[PDB]
Structure 1
Amino acid sequence: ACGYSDRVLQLTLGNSTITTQEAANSVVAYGRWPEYLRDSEANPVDQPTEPDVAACRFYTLDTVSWTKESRGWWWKLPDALRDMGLFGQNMYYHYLGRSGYTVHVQCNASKFHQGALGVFAVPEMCLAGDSNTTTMHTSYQNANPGEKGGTFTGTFTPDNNQTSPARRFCPVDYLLGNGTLLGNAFVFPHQIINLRTNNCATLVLPYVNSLSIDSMVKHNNWGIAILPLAPLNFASESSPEIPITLTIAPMCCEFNGLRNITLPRLQ
C-alpha cells in the first residue's frame, strides 16, 4: 500500500542511523530482544552504570576485503568493541558488564557478481588452537584481536616451534574453527548475504551467558563468524574483490564494580 518492505530498513540507535535497501528481513537471535538485567535475576548489589546512548550506538570496524581466495573471518564480542568510544571506556573501568548487540554486516556488489557469505552469531565461540603438543594454549593476546578480527584457514598447520610457541588459534573453515562441521552452523542465529538477493545481514543479539553478568575483559559472550558458502565471482575476471564492512551497536549495556581502569596486555 505505502510500499513498506522487508528489503528496505532503517535502524537508529543513539546518534546513529543505518539504512538498507536490499535486506533479507532481520534476525532476533533465539527470539529474544536485548534487555536490562531484571531485579529477580540480579547479582552484584551496587547500583550499575548504564551508559545508554553514549555506548548504545553503531560503531564501524575496519573494513576487510573479500576475494576468491578468502576463507573467512571471525570476531568476538565484546572484544571487537573494546576500543570503541564510551563503550570501551565503560568496559575497562568496571569489573563486570553485560550487553546485547545489533550486528550489521555490509557487502554490496552488482547484478553481475555472485557469491554468498554465511554470517553466524555463535554463543561461546571457542576456537581451536594451533598446537598438537599442548591444548588450550592460545594466549589472551592472540585470542583477542580487537576490531581487526581474525581469519579462518582451509588447512590445519600445527605449530612446531616448541621453544617459542606461536600460541594462536588455527581455525579450519569446514570445521567452523572448532571441530564441528560448518554445514551445521545454521543451528546458530544467522543470515546469508547472497549477492543476487541482498547486500547485508542484520542480527540482533541478546546477552547470552550462564550468569546474569560477568567479566567482559576475561570473557567473550558471542562470536561472529563470516564464511564464503559460495565463492566470489564476477563477469570473467580472475581476481575480483569486494569489501565487507561490520557495524555493531551495543544494546542495554550495564556495568558493575567500578574501580580504576583496566590496562590489559594486548601484544
Structure 2
Amino acid sequence: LTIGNSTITTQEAANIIVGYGEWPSYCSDSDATRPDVSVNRFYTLDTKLWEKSSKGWYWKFPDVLTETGVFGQNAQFHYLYRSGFCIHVQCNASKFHQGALLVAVLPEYVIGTVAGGTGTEDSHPPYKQTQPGADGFELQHPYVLDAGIPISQLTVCPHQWINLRTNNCATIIVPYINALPFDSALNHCNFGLLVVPISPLDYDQGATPVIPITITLAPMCSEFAGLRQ
C-alpha cells in the first residue's frame, strides 16, 4: 500500500474474511474533526511471548486503548469513538517448527472471576482485575477460558483457522458491529480478542524458544464525532 510516505508489502493471496460481508451504516435518528495526519501511522502492539508454556492472551476493546496510546490521547478529547479494526496476525517459523494457533473475535465477551466455597457470594471486580493495563494476564485454565466458556463452543461465531504451513501472515477485517449505533464509549465493551492455541508449540532443542508475534491495527473509519462534555 502506497499512500504518502508509507510503503509496506503484504500478501493479497490469503483468505480475507469479512463479518457477514456488510460495511457499517450511518444512523439517522435524533437522539442526542477527523485528524489522520499524525494518527494514521501504523501502531505495533508490544510483542507477546509465544512459548510452549504460553496459555494465551486476552484484551478488551476499546478498553485498553482508552488512554494508553495515541488513540487513547485523542480519544480523551471526544466523548465517543467508533472505527474499524485491522487484525494483523503473522506466523514466523522455520522448517523445524510445529504448532497451530486459533484466533477468534467474540462480541460481548463477559469476564468471570474466581468464586470458591459452598455459598455463592461474589464481590465486584477491582480496578486491576477489570483493566490490568498493558501488562495483561495469562489464562490459568483456558480449557474453559477462566470464564466458564469451554473451547468446544467458540466455533459458533464467525471464525477462521490458522495453519502456518501456507500463510506467512493473516489479515482480518471486522466492521464496526453493534446493536445500537449510538452507544457509550468508556462503558460498554464491544468485544474482546482471544488467542487460544490448539496445538502447543513444538521444536527440538537448538532453535529459538520464543516466536515474536506481531499485532498491528489501523483505523479503517476514523470518526470521533460526539460533543465536548
TM-score range for the pair, normalised by the shorter chain length: 0.7 to 0.9
What pairs up with 1:57-72 in 2 under 5 angstroms?
57-72=41-56
The whole-number CA distance in structure 1 between the counterparts of 2:7 and 2:157 is 27
Paired residues of 1:51 and 1:254 also in contact (CA < 8 A)? no
Structure 2 residue runs without a partner (length 5+): none
> What CA deviation, in whole Å up to 9, does each residue of 1:237-266 have, x standing for no partner?
69832122211122213231224xxxxxxx
What pairs up with 1:56-135 in 2 under 5 angstroms?
56-82=40-66, 83-85=68-70, 87-132=71-116, 134-135=121-122
Matched positions, count: 224
The alpha-carbon deviation at position 231 of structure 1 amounts to: 0.5
Which AA in structure 2 matches 1:248?
A: L
Q: TM-score, normalised by structure 1?
A: 0.71
Deviates more, 1:183-192 or 1:234-243: 234-243
What pairs up with 1:178-217 in 2 under 5 angstroms?
178-217=147-186
Change over 3 Å in CA distance of 1:198–1:39 after alignment to 2: same
Please identify which structure carries the higher helix content. 1
User: In structure 2, what is the equivalent of residue 161 of structure 1?
Assistant: none
Paired residues of 2:98 and 2:201 also in contact (CA < 8 A)? yes
Q: 1:98 is paired with a residue of what secondary structure?
A: coil
User: In structure 1, what is the equivalent of residue 227 of structure 2?
Assistant: 257
The whole-number CA distance in structure 1 between the counterparts of 2:90 and 2:210 is 14
User: In structure 2, what is the equivalent of residue 169 of structure 1?
Assistant: none
Please identify which structure carries the higher strand content. 1
Paired residues of 2:50 and 2:212 also in contact (CA < 8 A)? yes
Q: Establish whether residue 240 from structure 1 lines up as the match of residue 215 from structure 2.
A: no
The alpha-carbon deviation at position 135 of structure 1 amounts to: 3.7
The whole-number CA distance in structure 2 between the counterparts of 1:181 and 1:59 is 32
| 1:219 pairs with one of 188, 202, 223 | 188
> What CA deviation, in whole Å up to 9, does each residue of 1:86-141 have, x standing for no partner?
x2223222222222211112331112201111111111121211233544722343
**Greater relative CO, 1 or 2 (CA 8 Å, sep 6+):** 2
Structure 1 residue runs without a partner (length 5+): 1-9, 155-172, 260-267
| 1:174 pairs with one of 113, 123, 143 | 143
Identity of aligned residues (%): 50
The alpha-carbon deviation at position 183 of structure 1 amounts to: 2.3
Change over 3 Å in CA distance of 1:15–1:129 after alignment to 2: farther
Paired residues of 2:27 and 2:181 also in contact (CA < 8 A)? no
